[PDB]
């Protein structure tokens, strides 16, 4: 994999990864290293982790620096789902304590599409193929 | 491809795509549709486009709405390069009218690594494998 999408959290990487890998088939945590007692990040937070979503590798970290930005909808994860059941289930899960940008439903451009930010602020688009 | 990384620009999608697909082997524009005279986006801007970077599909659009956000470093594109020549060349190209976050060089964690935002604001990390 030459280009890997890389998510920078500020304390929630591990929780987020555990959540994401539960949503899709063939998704697992590959590797994870966590800060010990002497930092520079807070103890137990992610130094670096690699995980797959449906076989595709993603990376994340917990930043040891607080930044003045976070995730925006300008770079989003576009998910193509095989079935109505899958899109309904994944959307509802990702929507929990999230923010809806376009509610899941029918649009001129799509039989079934939605757009949200999840509870971590990560932007997801979901469509039925 | 179940999960596709999706970039939302405000007028520069096509230029950006042409730029990105020039930087890596086996990268091309797959499909592109552009707004005609009656919008809702400005004429000639991208309705939707799909392109590959080293075989991996990416999507982009030119948003027909101006947003109060853009790209941030919270979601970045992590590139693993095979050779010093490749990393030197791609970094220098992406740095043009960009912003350096970590200059390209040696670090405790890597023989050769850098982190920047390109001229469009898209955040890229580059490392030598």
From TrEMBL, chains A, B:
Instruction: Give start and end of each PhnB-like domain.
Output: 1-127
InterPro entries recorded = 3_dmu_93_MTrfase, Glyas_Bleomycin-R_OHBP_Dase, MTase_demethylubiq_bac, PhnB-like
Q: Under which name does UniProt file this protein? A: PhnB protein
Q: Which Pfam families match?
A: 3-dmu-9_3-mt (PF06983)
Q: What Gene3D superfamilies is this protein classified in?
A: 3.30.720.100, 3.30.720.110
């Amino acid at each position: 994999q030459k280009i890997t999408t890389f998510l920078m959290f500020e304390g929630k990487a591990e929780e987020a990864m555990n959540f994401y890998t539960s949503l899709f088939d063939q998704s697992e945590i590959v590797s994870i290293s966590r800060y010990d007692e002497n930092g520079p990040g807070k103890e137990g937070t992610v130094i670096h982790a690699t995980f797959t979503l449906n076989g595709q590798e993603f990376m994340c970290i917990d930043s040891y620096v607080n930044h003045n930005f976070t995730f925006t909808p300008a770079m989003s994860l576009y998910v193509t789902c095989e079935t109505e059941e899958e899109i309904d289930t994944v959307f509802h899960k990702l929507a929990q304590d999230g923010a809806i940008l376009m509610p899941l439903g029918s649009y001129p451009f799509s039989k079934k599409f939605g757009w949200l930010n999840d509870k971590y602020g990560v932007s997801w688009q979901l469509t039925l193929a």
